[PDB]
Amino acid sequence: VLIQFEQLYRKKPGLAITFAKLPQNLDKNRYKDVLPYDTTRVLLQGNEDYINASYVNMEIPAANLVNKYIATQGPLPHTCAQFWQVVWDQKLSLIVMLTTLTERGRTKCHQYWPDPPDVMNHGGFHIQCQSEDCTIAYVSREMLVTNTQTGEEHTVTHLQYVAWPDHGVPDDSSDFLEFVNYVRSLRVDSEPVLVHCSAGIGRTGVLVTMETAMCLTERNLPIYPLDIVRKMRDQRAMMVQTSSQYKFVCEAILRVYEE
């Protein structure tokens, strides 16, 4: 289990990564080594089409189910406009953020939403935070996004998980599992859920894996985490980054089963 994960490829052989490496796009990547594949990267309309974001879709035909995601990095100060453009273009209603802005004195994410009652403007979108409600492990916010060119409004639910430790992984998986079940509760139809952490591969991969395992468990279907991970990595490289993360995922999967 914890040995074949380490043997598994990080990037799918043959899959080109070219746009992410273009000189004009380099400072739009948070981490120089975490890049979207050309084939699954999200495209922006405009003269510069690039964001470090990937479409990641998890098919479970044995449940007549497809769970769509957009996996992305924490936006940078100069990529917030693009982040909100993706949210707008895809009319996404749920953003899941798996980090605090800083962890052990290191920046992980730019604050791309306002603290109420402030507002922000990014790429011609006005953002207002209508509500902010905390639980022990996470914060739920309702965002009103206004396209300043058209006056059109869109409501977006923003979930931020704040309890992940600055080192390693949660000692007790309960709160994270509750969070994933809340995310599942808000998922719509075949509408992607935007998920990000700092690079959009580690905690993001853990989340996608656990939602997938929960869907499988619910319909009494077999769960092979190494398959689930490979499937994600064919769509965004390096997802589920560390053995500690993979080990965490596995034990959690056995908990939900046994509980």
Numbering used by the authors: 646 to 904
Relevant lines from the article:
The ∼280 residue PTP catalytic domain consists of an α/β structure, and biochemical and structural studies have led to a detailed understanding of the catalytic mechanism (Barford et al., 1994; Zhang, 2002). Key features of the domain include the PTP signature motif, the mobile Trp-Pro-Asp “WPD” loop that in the closed conformation positions the conserved and catalytically important aspartate residue, and the phosphotyrosine recognition loop.
The second-site loop assumes a twisted conformation in these phosphatases. This architecture is present in the subgroups NT5 (PTPH1, MEG1), NT6 (PTPD1, PTPD2), R1 (CD45), R2B (RPTPμ, RPTPκ, RPTPρ), and R4 (RPTPα, RPTPɛ). PTPs with particularly high enzymatic activity against generic substrates were RPTPσ and PTP subgroups R5, R3, NT1, NT2, NT3, NT4, and NT5. The subgroups NT1, NT2, NT3, and NT5 exhibited a pronounced preference for acidic residues N-terminal to the phosphorylation site.
